Amino acid sequence: SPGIWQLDCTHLEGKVILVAVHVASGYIEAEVIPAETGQETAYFLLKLAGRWPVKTVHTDNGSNFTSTTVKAACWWAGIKQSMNKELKKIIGQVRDQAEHLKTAVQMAVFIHNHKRYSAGERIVDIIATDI
Amino acid sequence: SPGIWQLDCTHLEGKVILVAVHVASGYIEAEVIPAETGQETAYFLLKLAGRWPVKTVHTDNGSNFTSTTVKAACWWAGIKQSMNKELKKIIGQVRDQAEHLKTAVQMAVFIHNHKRYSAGERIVDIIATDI
Numbered sequence: 600s601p602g603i604w605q606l607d608c609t610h611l612e613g614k615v616i617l618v619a620v621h622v623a624s625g626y627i628e629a630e631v632i633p634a635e636t637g638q639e640t641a642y643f644l645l646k647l648a649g650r651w652p653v654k655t656v657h658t659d660n661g662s663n664f665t666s667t668t669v670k671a672a673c674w675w676a677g678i679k680q681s682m683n684k685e686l687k688k689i690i691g692q693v694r695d696q697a698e699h700l701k702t703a704v705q706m707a708v709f710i711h712n713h714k715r716y717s718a719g720e721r722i723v724d725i726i727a728t729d730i
Numbered sequence: 731s732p733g734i735w736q737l738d739c740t741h742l743e744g745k746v747i748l749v750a751v752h753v754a755s756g757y758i759e760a761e762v763i764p765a766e767t768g769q770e771t772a773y774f775l776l777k778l779a780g781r782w783p784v785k786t787v788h789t790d791n792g793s794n795f796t797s798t799t800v801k802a803a804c805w806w807a808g809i810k811q812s813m814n815k816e817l818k819k820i821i822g823q824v825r826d827q828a829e830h831l832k833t834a835v836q837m838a839v840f841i842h843n844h845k846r847y848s849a850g851e852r853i854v855d856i857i858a859t860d861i
């Protein structure tokens with residue numbers, strides 16, 4: 600289904616990377632956050648839901664979604680309940696080219712979503728067709 | 731053209747809101763940043779370019795784009811050189827429902843992009859057709 604996303608955090612350099620994957624396309628969005636908290640997860644979900652038609656979200660750590668703040672973001676936005684290793688591979692390849700990890704992360708996201716169709720091309724096609 | 735974006739900052743509550751508008755669709759992405767700096771603008775452009783096919787960017791304040799950091803983000807991502815009032819209207823309507831301005835901003839972005847086709851529907855259609 601085109602509405603399914605998966606969200607997980609990854610750790611690197613003592614920081615936290617929140618990674619969202621559109622399951623049908625492989626498209627990724629990511630953000631570096633200071634620590635794993637429900638508030639950061641909730642805020643990310645609000646941003647994601649404003650950009651794409653997010654219907655359901657999965658995760659590999661179910662406890663990620665237990666906080667009152669996450670539940671409120673899900674409620675308001677109407678959300679119901681590998682590539683990560685690929686992303687860390689790309690991050691590692693570009694890491695020395697940037698001062699800050701967050702820059703390297705966005706470089707890796709850019710590379711992933713435009714590498715070849717591309718993931719960025721597939722998501723827009725999938726969503727447009729579903730409309 | 732489907733590759734044209736406009737970026738501007740707006741001020742509210744002593745904070746800075748960076749607003750990107752996809753010109754052909756009216757779709758918006760926004761972020762609350764602590765202050766107007768080239769580093770924040772450059773980082774935002776890197777994130778935007780990884781998500782959409784950003785070919786050119788416009789602004790109502792040309793000096794926004796003079797810093798070395800912005801130029802480097804543009805160079806790497808291959809970027810060449812009203813609704814904002816609407817967004818402030820929506821922000822004002824939902825502001826008292828959230829503690830933090832940043833939450834109200836993302837609520838307003840969500841409302842704008844899904845209000846009716848919707849801006850979110852138009853951008854994916856425009857980009858998919860262009861492929």
Ligand SMILES: Cc1nc2ccccc2c(-c2ccc3c4c(ccnc24)CCO3)c1[C@H](OC(C)(C)C)C(=O)O
Pocket residue numbers: 637638639641642645667668669671672673675676827828829830831833834837
């Ligand atoms: C601080 C807080 N604290 C909270 C404590 C308990 C429950 C929710 C929050 C919420 C909250 C979360 C998600 C929402 C909210 C909405 C209105 C009001 N609050 C929230 C509509 C959209 O989604 C929040 C919000 O802050 C974060 C989004 C960064 C967590 C807020 O600014 O009010």
Ligand SMILES: Cc1nc2ccccc2c(-c2ccc3c4c(ccnc24)CCO3)c1[C@H](OC(C)(C)C)C(=O)O
Pocket residue numbers: 696697698699700702703706768769770772773776798799800802803804806807
């Ligand atoms: C701190 C800095 N300082 C700078 C000083 C001068 C010029 C660029 C920066 C850059 C820079 C900007 C854009 C890029 C960069 C890339 C590699 C290295 N640096 C950058 C590829 C993608 O786009 C940066 C980067 O930091 C921000 C992105 C937050 C500004 C960085 O982490 O290296």
